[PDB]
mmCIF file of C-alpha atoms (C1' of nucleotides) and ligand atoms in Angstrom:
data_model
loop_
_atom_site.group_PDB
_atom_site.id
_atom_site.type_symbol
_atom_site.label_atom_id
_atom_site.label_comp_id
_atom_site.label_asym_id
_atom_site.label_seq_id
_atom_site.Cartn_x
_atom_site.Cartn_y
_atom_site.Cartn_z
ATOM 1 C CA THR A 1 -93.403 144.706 149.779
ATOM 2 C CA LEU A 2 -90.366 146.810 150.715
ATOM 3 C CA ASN A 3 -87.907 145.751 148.017
ATOM 4 C CA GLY A 4 -89.547 142.539 146.802
ATOM 5 C CA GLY A 5 -89.398 143.644 143.190
ATOM 6 C CA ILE A 6 -85.662 144.194 143.528
ATOM 7 C CA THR A 7 -85.031 140.910 145.356
ATOM 8 C CA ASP A 8 -87.116 138.898 142.866
ATOM 9 C CA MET A 9 -85.224 140.545 139.985
ATOM 10 C CA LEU A 10 -81.852 139.635 141.495
ATOM 11 C CA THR A 11 -82.979 136.100 142.317
ATOM 12 C CA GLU A 12 -84.233 135.580 138.773
ATOM 13 C CA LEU A 13 -80.925 136.899 137.426
ATOM 14 C CA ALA A 14 -79.120 134.498 139.765
ATOM 15 C CA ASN A 15 -80.979 131.492 138.359
ATOM 16 C CA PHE A 16 -80.171 132.298 134.720
ATOM 17 C CA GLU A 17 -76.503 132.732 135.614
ATOM 18 C CA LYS A 18 -76.447 129.311 137.273
ATOM 19 C CA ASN A 19 -78.704 127.355 134.910
ATOM 20 C CA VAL A 20 -78.089 128.965 131.515
ATOM 21 C CA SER A 21 -74.772 130.840 131.652
ATOM 22 C CA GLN A 22 -73.239 128.286 134.044
ATOM 23 C CA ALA A 23 -71.555 131.014 136.104
ATOM 24 C CA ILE A 24 -71.885 129.733 139.678
ATOM 25 C CA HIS A 25 -69.943 132.660 141.128
ATOM 26 C CA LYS A 26 -72.257 135.240 139.535
ATOM 27 C CA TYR A 27 -75.131 133.077 140.747
ATOM 28 C CA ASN A 28 -73.890 133.462 144.342
ATOM 29 C CA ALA A 29 -73.096 137.142 143.833
ATOM 30 C CA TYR A 30 -76.713 137.880 142.889
ATOM 31 C CA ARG A 31 -78.062 135.770 145.766
ATOM 32 C CA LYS A 32 -75.744 137.492 148.229
ATOM 33 C CA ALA A 33 -76.913 140.852 146.916
ATOM 34 C CA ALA A 34 -80.542 139.729 147.127
ATOM 35 C CA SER A 35 -80.098 138.534 150.724
ATOM 36 C CA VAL A 36 -78.505 141.680 152.110
ATOM 37 C CA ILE A 37 -81.237 143.686 150.356
ATOM 38 C CA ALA A 38 -83.942 141.444 151.795
ATOM 39 C CA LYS A 39 -82.637 142.378 155.257
ATOM 40 C CA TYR A 40 -82.408 146.132 154.596
ATOM 41 C CA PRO A 41 -85.237 147.737 156.684
ATOM 42 C CA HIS A 42 -85.928 150.497 154.153
ATOM 43 C CA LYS A 43 -87.511 150.827 150.740
ATOM 44 C CA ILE A 44 -84.528 151.466 148.482
ATOM 45 C CA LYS A 45 -84.958 154.619 146.425
ATOM 46 C CA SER A 46 -81.825 154.439 144.272
ATOM 47 C CA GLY A 47 -78.932 152.309 143.109
ATOM 48 C CA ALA A 48 -76.530 154.534 145.036
ATOM 49 C CA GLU A 49 -78.381 153.794 148.266
ATOM 50 C CA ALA A 50 -78.199 150.058 147.561
ATOM 51 C CA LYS A 51 -74.506 150.115 146.640
ATOM 52 C CA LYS A 52 -73.652 151.036 150.246
ATOM 53 C CA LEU A 53 -74.609 147.493 151.273
ATOM 54 C CA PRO A 54 -71.950 144.750 151.105
ATOM 55 C CA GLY A 55 -72.566 142.522 148.099
ATOM 56 C CA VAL A 56 -74.136 145.208 145.907
ATOM 57 C CA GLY A 57 -71.788 146.668 143.340
ATOM 58 C CA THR A 58 -71.817 149.086 140.432
ATOM 59 C CA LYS A 59 -73.737 146.887 138.001
ATOM 60 C CA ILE A 60 -76.452 145.796 140.414
ATOM 61 C CA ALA A 61 -76.767 149.449 141.430
ATOM 62 C CA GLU A 62 -77.314 150.367 137.779
ATOM 63 C CA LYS A 63 -79.846 147.547 137.399
ATOM 64 C CA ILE A 64 -81.748 148.818 140.427
ATOM 65 C CA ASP A 65 -81.774 152.337 138.975
ATOM 66 C CA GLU A 66 -83.338 150.921 135.804
ATOM 67 C CA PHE A 67 -85.875 148.799 137.682
ATOM 68 C CA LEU A 68 -86.936 151.685 139.891
ATOM 69 C CA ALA A 69 -87.339 154.106 137.003
ATOM 70 C CA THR A 70 -89.079 151.772 134.526
ATOM 71 C CA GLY A 71 -90.505 149.044 136.739
ATOM 72 C CA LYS A 72 -88.582 146.349 134.847
ATOM 73 C CA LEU A 73 -85.176 145.260 133.533
ATOM 74 C CA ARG A 74 -84.782 144.996 129.739
ATOM 75 C CA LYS A 75 -82.299 142.094 129.909
ATOM 76 C CA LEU A 76 -84.529 140.068 132.232
ATOM 77 C CA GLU A 77 -87.632 140.745 130.100
ATOM 78 C CA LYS A 78 -85.739 139.528 127.041
ATOM 79 C CA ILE A 79 -84.381 136.413 128.751
ATOM 80 C CA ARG A 80 -87.864 135.480 130.005
ATOM 81 C CA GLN A 81 -89.308 135.410 126.490
ATOM 82 C CA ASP A 82 -86.343 133.484 125.067
ATOM 83 C CA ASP A 83 -87.597 129.970 124.306
ATOM 84 C CA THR A 84 -84.169 128.344 124.688
ATOM 85 C CA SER A 85 -83.078 130.050 127.897
ATOM 86 C CA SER A 86 -86.394 129.785 129.721
ATOM 87 C CA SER A 87 -86.589 126.084 128.849
ATOM 88 C CA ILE A 88 -83.058 125.375 130.060
ATOM 89 C CA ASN A 89 -83.738 127.297 133.249
ATOM 90 C CA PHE A 90 -87.003 125.398 133.720
ATOM 91 C CA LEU A 91 -85.652 121.884 133.184
ATOM 92 C CA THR A 92 -83.072 122.368 135.940
ATOM 93 C CA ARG A 93 -85.968 122.366 138.393
ATOM 94 C CA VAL A 94 -85.974 118.596 137.859
ATOM 95 C CA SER A 95 -83.700 117.011 140.485
ATOM 96 C CA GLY A 96 -80.939 115.235 138.614
ATOM 97 C CA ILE A 97 -81.031 117.665 135.708
ATOM 98 C CA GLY A 98 -78.341 120.288 136.133
ATOM 99 C CA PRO A 99 -77.242 123.084 133.736
ATOM 100 C CA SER A 100 -75.327 120.623 131.563
ATOM 101 C CA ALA A 101 -78.152 118.111 131.139
ATOM 102 C CA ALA A 102 -80.786 120.844 130.720
ATOM 103 C CA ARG A 103 -78.703 122.409 127.959
ATOM 104 C CA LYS A 104 -78.235 119.092 126.168
ATOM 105 C CA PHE A 105 -81.931 118.252 126.395
ATOM 106 C CA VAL A 106 -82.928 121.617 124.923
ATOM 107 C CA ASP A 107 -80.360 121.269 122.120
ATOM 108 C CA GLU A 108 -82.186 118.156 120.943
ATOM 109 C CA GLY A 109 -85.720 119.510 121.291
ATOM 110 C CA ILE A 110 -86.564 118.287 124.793
ATOM 111 C CA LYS A 111 -87.928 121.380 126.547
ATOM 112 C CA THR A 112 -90.852 120.377 128.770
ATOM 113 C CA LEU A 113 -91.801 117.835 131.420
ATOM 114 C CA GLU A 114 -94.031 116.377 128.726
ATOM 115 C CA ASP A 115 -91.047 115.890 126.413
ATOM 116 C CA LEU A 116 -89.075 114.343 129.280
ATOM 117 C CA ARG A 117 -91.931 111.930 130.003
ATOM 118 C CA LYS A 118 -91.784 110.565 126.452
ATOM 119 C CA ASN A 119 -87.988 110.320 126.410
ATOM 120 C CA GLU A 120 -87.457 108.200 129.512
ATOM 121 C CA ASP A 121 -84.662 106.289 127.800
ATOM 122 C CA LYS A 122 -82.671 109.529 127.844
ATOM 123 C CA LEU A 123 -82.953 110.070 131.611
ATOM 124 C CA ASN A 124 -80.640 108.466 134.175
ATOM 125 C CA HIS A 125 -82.095 106.882 137.343
ATOM 126 C CA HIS A 126 -81.871 110.043 139.447
ATOM 127 C CA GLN A 127 -83.524 112.179 136.772
ATOM 128 C CA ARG A 128 -86.441 109.742 136.359
ATOM 129 C CA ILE A 129 -87.110 109.974 140.104
ATOM 130 C CA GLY A 130 -86.828 113.742 139.917
ATOM 131 C CA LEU A 131 -89.424 113.808 137.150
ATOM 132 C CA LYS A 132 -91.722 111.424 139.001
ATOM 133 C CA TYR A 133 -91.764 113.674 142.074
ATOM 134 C CA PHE A 134 -91.377 117.043 140.366
ATOM 135 C CA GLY A 135 -94.311 118.556 142.213
ATOM 136 C CA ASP A 136 -93.731 116.967 145.618
ATOM 137 C CA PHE A 137 -90.070 118.028 145.620
ATOM 138 C CA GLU A 138 -90.937 121.721 145.256
ATOM 139 C CA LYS A 139 -93.344 121.637 148.218
ATOM 140 C CA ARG A 140 -92.020 122.558 151.649
ATOM 141 C CA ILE A 141 -92.325 120.318 154.699
ATOM 142 C CA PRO A 142 -94.340 121.621 157.662
ATOM 143 C CA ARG A 143 -92.621 121.153 161.034
ATOM 144 C CA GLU A 144 -95.405 118.848 162.259
ATOM 145 C CA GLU A 145 -94.654 116.447 159.424
ATOM 146 C CA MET A 146 -90.936 116.783 160.076
ATOM 147 C CA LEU A 147 -91.607 115.701 163.671
ATOM 148 C CA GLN A 148 -93.562 112.687 162.428
ATOM 149 C CA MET A 149 -90.695 111.896 160.083
ATOM 150 C CA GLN A 150 -88.166 112.164 162.935
ATOM 151 C CA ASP A 151 -90.271 109.813 165.061
ATOM 152 C CA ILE A 152 -89.987 107.127 162.399
ATOM 153 C CA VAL A 153 -86.289 107.703 161.716
ATOM 154 C CA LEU A 154 -85.245 107.586 165.392
ATOM 155 C CA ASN A 155 -87.504 104.594 166.124
ATOM 156 C CA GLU A 156 -86.228 102.418 163.265
ATOM 157 C CA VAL A 157 -82.597 103.429 163.761
ATOM 158 C CA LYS A 158 -82.776 102.396 167.430
ATOM 159 C CA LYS A 159 -84.592 99.213 166.416
ATOM 160 C CA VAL A 160 -81.623 98.188 164.237
ATOM 161 C CA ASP A 161 -79.056 98.863 166.961
ATOM 162 C CA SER A 162 -79.801 100.879 170.090
ATOM 163 C CA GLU A 163 -76.190 102.046 169.999
ATOM 164 C CA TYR A 164 -76.625 104.147 166.842
ATOM 165 C CA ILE A 165 -76.851 107.879 167.420
ATOM 166 C CA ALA A 166 -79.036 109.789 164.957
ATOM 167 C CA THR A 167 -79.659 113.525 164.781
ATOM 168 C CA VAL A 168 -81.948 115.330 162.342
ATOM 169 C CA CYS A 169 -80.166 118.561 161.442
ATOM 170 C CA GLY A 170 -80.846 121.400 159.020
ATOM 171 C CA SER A 171 -83.075 124.383 159.801
ATOM 172 C CA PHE A 172 -85.433 121.898 161.454
ATOM 173 C CA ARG A 173 -83.010 121.488 164.346
ATOM 174 C CA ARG A 174 -82.841 125.277 164.636
ATOM 175 C CA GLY A 175 -86.606 125.352 165.184
ATOM 176 C CA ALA A 176 -87.738 126.309 161.664
ATOM 177 C CA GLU A 177 -91.499 126.098 161.055
ATOM 178 C CA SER A 178 -90.892 124.348 157.725
ATOM 179 C CA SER A 179 -88.080 122.471 155.991
ATOM 180 C CA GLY A 180 -87.191 121.675 152.392
ATOM 181 C CA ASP A 181 -85.936 118.186 153.189
ATOM 182 C CA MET A 182 -84.684 115.976 156.014
ATOM 183 C CA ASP A 183 -80.989 115.612 156.799
ATOM 184 C CA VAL A 184 -80.098 112.824 159.236
ATOM 185 C CA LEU A 185 -76.556 112.524 160.637
ATOM 186 C CA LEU A 186 -75.695 109.066 161.879
ATOM 187 C CA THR A 187 -72.859 107.491 163.833
ATOM 188 C CA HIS A 188 -72.078 104.386 165.887
ATOM 189 C CA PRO A 189 -69.367 103.707 168.530
ATOM 190 C CA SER A 190 -67.860 101.046 166.250
ATOM 191 C CA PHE A 191 -67.059 103.605 163.537
ATOM 192 C CA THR A 192 -64.275 106.129 164.133
ATOM 193 C CA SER A 193 -61.722 107.859 161.904
ATOM 194 C CA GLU A 194 -59.239 105.045 162.567
ATOM 195 C CA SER A 195 -61.116 101.739 162.815
ATOM 196 C CA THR A 196 -64.499 100.525 161.567
ATOM 197 C CA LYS A 197 -72.813 97.962 156.557
ATOM 198 C CA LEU A 198 -73.630 100.499 159.277
ATOM 199 C CA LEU A 199 -75.395 102.805 156.839
ATOM 200 C CA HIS A 200 -76.916 100.027 154.724
ATOM 201 C CA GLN A 201 -78.664 98.373 157.678
ATOM 202 C CA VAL A 202 -80.422 101.599 158.630
ATOM 203 C CA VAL A 203 -81.395 102.364 155.034
ATOM 204 C CA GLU A 204 -82.710 98.823 154.706
ATOM 205 C CA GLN A 205 -84.891 99.005 157.818
ATOM 206 C CA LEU A 206 -86.391 102.283 156.621
ATOM 207 C CA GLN A 207 -87.231 100.636 153.270
ATOM 208 C CA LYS A 208 -88.636 97.563 155.018
ATOM 209 C CA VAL A 209 -91.225 99.646 156.914
ATOM 210 C CA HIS A 210 -91.858 101.520 153.671
ATOM 211 C CA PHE A 211 -90.720 104.968 154.819
ATOM 212 C CA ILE A 212 -87.914 105.248 152.252
ATOM 213 C CA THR A 213 -89.447 104.710 148.810
ATOM 214 C CA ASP A 214 -86.641 105.584 146.389
ATOM 215 C CA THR A 215 -82.842 105.791 146.204
ATOM 216 C CA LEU A 216 -81.041 108.619 144.394
ATOM 217 C CA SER A 217 -77.551 107.565 145.465
ATOM 218 C CA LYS A 218 -76.099 105.284 148.130
ATOM 219 C CA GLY A 219 -72.580 104.536 149.281
ATOM 220 C CA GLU A 220 -70.848 103.524 152.494
ATOM 221 C CA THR A 221 -71.235 106.921 154.159
ATOM 222 C CA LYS A 222 -73.958 108.843 152.316
ATOM 223 C CA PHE A 223 -77.491 108.004 151.275
ATOM 224 C CA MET A 224 -79.736 110.311 149.276
ATOM 225 C CA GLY A 225 -83.256 109.197 148.585
ATOM 226 C CA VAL A 226 -86.951 109.722 148.914
ATOM 227 C CA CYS A 227 -89.326 109.013 151.769
ATOM 228 C CA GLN A 228 -93.013 109.357 152.557
ATOM 229 C CA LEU A 229 -95.095 109.471 155.731
ATOM 230 C CA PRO A 230 -97.806 106.805 155.906
ATOM 231 C CA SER A 231 -101.357 108.083 155.462
ATOM 232 C CA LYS A 232 -104.414 106.760 157.276
ATOM 233 C CA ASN A 233 -107.256 105.149 155.335
ATOM 234 C CA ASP A 234 -109.358 107.835 153.622
ATOM 235 C CA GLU A 235 -106.996 110.727 154.367
ATOM 236 C CA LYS A 236 -105.095 112.125 151.389
ATOM 237 C CA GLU A 237 -101.594 110.897 150.535
ATOM 238 C CA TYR A 238 -98.654 112.847 151.985
ATOM 239 C CA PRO A 239 -96.201 114.069 149.368
ATOM 240 C CA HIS A 240 -92.868 112.331 148.801
ATOM 241 C CA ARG A 241 -89.884 114.077 150.398
ATOM 242 C CA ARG A 242 -86.134 114.283 149.988
ATOM 243 C CA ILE A 243 -84.096 112.672 152.716
ATOM 244 C CA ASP A 244 -80.345 112.386 153.177
ATOM 245 C CA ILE A 245 -78.582 110.135 155.678
ATOM 246 C CA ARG A 246 -74.902 110.584 156.492
ATOM 247 C CA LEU A 247 -72.807 108.079 158.434
ATOM 248 C CA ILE A 248 -70.042 110.012 160.187
ATOM 249 C CA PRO A 249 -67.151 108.681 162.315
ATOM 250 C CA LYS A 250 -67.963 109.014 166.028
ATOM 251 C CA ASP A 251 -64.948 111.258 166.674
ATOM 252 C CA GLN A 252 -66.117 113.683 163.971
ATOM 253 C CA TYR A 253 -69.823 113.379 164.688
ATOM 254 C CA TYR A 254 -70.296 116.565 166.689
ATOM 255 C CA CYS A 255 -68.278 118.723 164.301
ATOM 256 C CA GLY A 256 -70.583 117.259 161.671
ATOM 257 C CA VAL A 257 -73.772 118.057 163.576
ATOM 258 C CA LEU A 258 -72.592 121.609 164.263
ATOM 259 C CA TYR A 259 -71.845 122.200 160.591
ATOM 260 C CA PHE A 260 -75.038 120.610 159.286
ATOM 261 C CA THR A 261 -77.215 122.600 161.690
ATOM 262 C CA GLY A 262 -75.810 125.974 160.627
ATOM 263 C CA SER A 263 -77.000 128.434 159.716
ATOM 264 C CA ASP A 264 -74.382 129.133 157.053
ATOM 265 C CA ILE A 265 -73.932 132.634 158.470
ATOM 266 C CA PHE A 266 -73.421 131.123 161.916
ATOM 267 C CA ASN A 267 -70.811 128.708 160.556
ATOM 268 C CA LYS A 268 -68.874 131.541 158.874
ATOM 269 C CA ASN A 269 -68.925 133.563 162.097
ATOM 270 C CA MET A 270 -68.013 130.630 164.325
ATOM 271 C CA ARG A 271 -65.127 129.715 162.011
ATOM 272 C CA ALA A 272 -63.949 133.321 161.878
ATOM 273 C CA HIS A 273 -64.093 133.498 165.664
ATOM 274 C CA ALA A 274 -62.191 130.225 166.136
ATOM 275 C CA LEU A 275 -59.319 131.569 164.025
ATOM 276 C CA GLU A 276 -59.051 134.466 166.479
ATOM 277 C CA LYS A 277 -58.606 132.048 169.365
ATOM 278 C CA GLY A 278 -55.993 130.129 167.405
ATOM 279 C CA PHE A 279 -58.214 127.297 166.170
ATOM 280 C CA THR A 280 -59.266 126.058 162.740
ATOM 281 C CA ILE A 281 -62.720 124.498 162.578
ATOM 282 C CA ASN A 282 -64.030 122.578 159.594
ATOM 283 C CA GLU A 283 -66.812 120.071 158.944
ATOM 284 C CA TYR A 284 -64.770 117.278 160.507
ATOM 285 C CA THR A 285 -62.630 118.711 163.276
ATOM 286 C CA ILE A 286 -61.251 121.587 165.316
ATOM 287 C CA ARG A 287 -57.478 121.837 165.356
ATOM 288 C CA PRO A 288 -55.123 124.254 167.141
ATOM 289 C CA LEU A 289 -52.927 126.615 165.138
ATOM 290 C CA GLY A 290 -49.254 127.077 165.948
ATOM 291 C CA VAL A 291 -47.730 130.558 166.049
ATOM 292 C CA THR A 292 -46.564 130.073 162.444
ATOM 293 C CA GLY A 293 -50.018 129.003 161.274
ATOM 294 C CA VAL A 294 -49.395 125.250 161.253
ATOM 295 C CA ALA A 295 -52.380 123.092 162.210
ATOM 296 C CA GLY A 296 -51.940 120.570 164.992
ATOM 297 C CA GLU A 297 -53.696 117.242 165.508
ATOM 298 C CA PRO A 298 -57.521 117.213 165.834
ATOM 299 C CA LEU A 299 -58.733 117.944 169.367
ATOM 300 C CA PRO A 300 -61.085 115.477 171.109
ATOM 301 C CA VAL A 301 -64.765 116.439 170.697
ATOM 302 C CA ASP A 302 -67.619 114.648 172.482
ATOM 303 C CA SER A 303 -70.417 117.194 172.228
ATOM 304 C CA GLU A 304 -71.195 120.453 170.447
ATOM 305 C CA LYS A 305 -70.357 122.290 173.670
ATOM 306 C CA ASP A 306 -66.763 121.032 173.603
ATOM 307 C CA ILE A 307 -66.342 122.926 170.343
ATOM 308 C CA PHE A 308 -67.721 126.105 171.942
ATOM 309 C CA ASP A 309 -65.522 125.627 175.023
ATOM 310 C CA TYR A 310 -62.373 125.407 172.897
ATOM 311 C CA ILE A 311 -62.958 128.850 171.408
ATOM 312 C CA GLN A 312 -64.157 130.178 174.768
ATOM 313 C CA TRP A 313 -67.627 130.878 173.372
ATOM 314 C CA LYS A 314 -70.841 130.418 175.344
ATOM 315 C CA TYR A 315 -72.888 127.430 174.203
ATOM 316 C CA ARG A 316 -75.641 128.692 171.921
ATOM 317 C CA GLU A 317 -78.843 126.718 171.459
ATOM 318 C CA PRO A 318 -79.562 125.598 167.902
ATOM 319 C CA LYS A 319 -82.584 127.939 167.897
ATOM 320 C CA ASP A 320 -80.184 130.847 168.501
ATOM 321 C CA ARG A 321 -77.793 130.093 165.631
ATOM 322 C CA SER A 322 -79.481 132.234 162.979
ATOM 323 C CA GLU A 323 -76.099 133.950 162.793
ATOM 324 C "C1'" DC B 1 -55.617 144.081 137.596
ATOM 325 C "C1'" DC B 2 -56.997 139.914 138.315
ATOM 326 C "C1'" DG B 3 -57.890 135.695 141.380
ATOM 327 C "C1'" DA B 4 -61.183 134.066 145.117
ATOM 328 C "C1'" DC B 5 -65.511 133.035 145.491
ATOM 329 C "C1'" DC B 6 -65.770 127.353 145.514
ATOM 330 C "C1'" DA B 7 -69.357 122.028 151.305
ATOM 331 C "C1'" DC B 8 -67.760 116.666 148.843
ATOM 332 C "C1'" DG B 9 -69.807 111.654 148.184
ATOM 333 C "C1'" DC B 10 -71.718 109.108 144.663
ATOM 334 C "C1'" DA B 11 -73.248 108.110 139.632
ATOM 335 C "C1'" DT B 12 -71.679 108.242 135.298
ATOM 336 C "C1'" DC B 13 -68.877 109.603 131.600
ATOM 337 C "C1'" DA B 14 -64.299 110.027 128.937
ATOM 338 C "C1'" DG B 15 -60.029 107.911 128.255
ATOM 339 C "C1'" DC B 16 -56.773 104.414 128.493
ATOM 340 C "C1'" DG C 1 -61.390 96.089 133.072
ATOM 341 C "C1'" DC C 2 -59.501 100.462 135.708
ATOM 342 C "C1'" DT C 3 -58.531 105.547 136.820
ATOM 343 C "C1'" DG C 4 -59.626 110.086 136.744
ATOM 344 C "C1'" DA C 5 -62.920 113.861 135.378
ATOM 345 C "C1'" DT C 6 -67.400 115.741 135.319
ATOM 346 C "C1'" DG C 7 -72.088 116.598 136.809
ATOM 347 C "C1'" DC C 8 -74.980 116.930 140.577
ATOM 348 C "C1'" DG C 9 -77.111 118.235 144.838
ATOM 349 C "C1'" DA C 10 -76.100 118.600 148.590
ATOM 350 C "C1'" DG D 1 -70.689 140.348 139.961
ATOM 351 C "C1'" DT D 2 -68.284 141.842 144.017
ATOM 352 C "C1'" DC D 3 -64.581 142.290 146.762
ATOM 353 C "C1'" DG D 4 -59.937 143.010 147.824
ATOM 354 C "C1'" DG D 5 -54.859 141.648 147.918
HETATM 355 NA NA1 LIG E 1 -71.452 147.542 148.021
HETATM 356 NA NA1 LIG E 2 -82.005 120.100 138.732
HETATM 357 NA NA1 LIG E 3 -58.390 108.533 134.223
#
DNA sequence: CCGACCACGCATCAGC
DNA sequence: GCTGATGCGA
DNA sequence: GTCGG
């Protein structure tokens, strides 16, 4: 209610930049602006007021001035009514259909889910799955269902080999009340950066008990697919969900878990901090920095805490990593 | 003024 | 056939 | 689009 009109406006602008104009950096600029504004504890009264926040520049300030004075933004109103642009933007909501595919589909008259349905031969495997679960994929996942999903994942993984180590990351691990998907990081003592079907066997067991229902992509270290909780007789059917499974070398596992648990703000801050202490932390490792800025060999990591110890930072619970 | 910004593994395309 | 680029959603 | 070297 505070600045929702402003944040929706910026978010909508972001989407058109990404999906229609294919300007990913403007996309992020608008989102960044929208985020900082979403956190501002005051109802913005002018573009000048908003420009004081990091991420809001001259143009977004001008756009806010227009929105506040007229209650709308001419450019956005025009874009919304544009048949071509609104269709391109809409099609990208289908997983598998990015800005490029959406643009090509619209160029040849394919503009709706209905048109996609009757042009199956023009969709790749991923896109067909995205169309099939269009609705389910836009629904969020309540934490209670995420817990039920975790139960199955951890149970089957252990059933395949009790030596596997699996961790469900994402906002879920930080305690979020709802998730958009499930991200499982996996490792095994037999797989390290130096020596090594570890992923395949887990994916297969999950398909055998009918938890995983579809495959978007699958290689030796990353699986992206679809899964669904079993429903009891009578009870309605749970919606299909997106699930990713990543096999990560044991010696890089904890740097992986840290990264994939975030938040993104927390990662940026933790990385920034590390640099201060003379360390460079990435998704895979934490390495010391020489006085001339040269990175040394990766330091041994056997828990998230080790990472924190290295940079002399107190261990913070996942729940307390909002930033 | 003008370049950074920019998760990377897997599916599929463009080219040889 | 293979190699590298591109699209895509992480 | 915004920031900043
Ligand atoms: Na600003
Ligand atoms: Na899409
Ligand atoms: Na090539």
